Design a protein around this nucleic acid. Sequence first.
RNA 1: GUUUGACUGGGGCGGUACGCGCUCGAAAAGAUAUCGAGCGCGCCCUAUGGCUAUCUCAGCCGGGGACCCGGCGAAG
Length: 140
Amino acid sequence: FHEMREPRIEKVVVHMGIGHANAEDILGEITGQMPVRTKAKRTVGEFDIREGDPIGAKVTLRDEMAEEFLQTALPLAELATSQFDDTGNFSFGLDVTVNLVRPGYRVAKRDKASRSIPTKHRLNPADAVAFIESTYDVEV
RNA sequence: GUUUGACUGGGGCGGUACGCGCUCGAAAAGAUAUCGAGCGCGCCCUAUGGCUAUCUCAGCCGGGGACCCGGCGAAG
Ligand SMILES: [Mg+2]
Ligand SMILES: [Mg+2]
Ligand SMILES: [Mg+2]
Ligand code: NA
Ligand code: NA
Ligand code: NA
Ligand SMILES: [Sr+2]
Ligand SMILES: [Sr+2]
């Protein structure tokens, strides 16, 4: 029961919301894999009337890539209870987002007979702080 | 030598109900008038057409009015 309930890392998304790019090179270094451009929507007074066009970049890491990143990334932040989602997610900072979830998450990400994850199987902030804190760092 | 139209609560002036589309008037099939009420069309587009692949939108909340992550969300 506990084995298929103990949290894990779905993905670690690192992104730099600039607003017009040349910053891909560092992400390609700090994470290890190719980043992708970020386009915006809706015209914007702040000389941002171009809908589709480079404005940011991000890198989504999974498995090892994700953990090998957090090992050297988490120590760079000072996690706090507020910094946590209602789903058991937390992001710090160049933004760094950590998406945590339980084993059979796929049930909501697959194509056939997908289904939404029952709140009971949904990760909790409490369960989140724990799991994480239970590995190289402090809380509040 | 001719023409100078029609409609119209008389005619003139005003207007066009003079060709078209929608809601209501219209009375739960269809049809249905007034110078009836609300209001549009005489285009624009080589993509703003076609198919395929991948995908889900408004709006609100939570975490780092531009961007990133998650949640709610049959359609506003
Ligand atoms: Mg004669
Ligand atoms: Mg007459
Ligand atoms: Mg009828
Ligand atoms: Na781009
Ligand atoms: Na005539
Ligand atoms: Na009159
Ligand atoms: Sr005459
Ligand atoms: Sr009279």
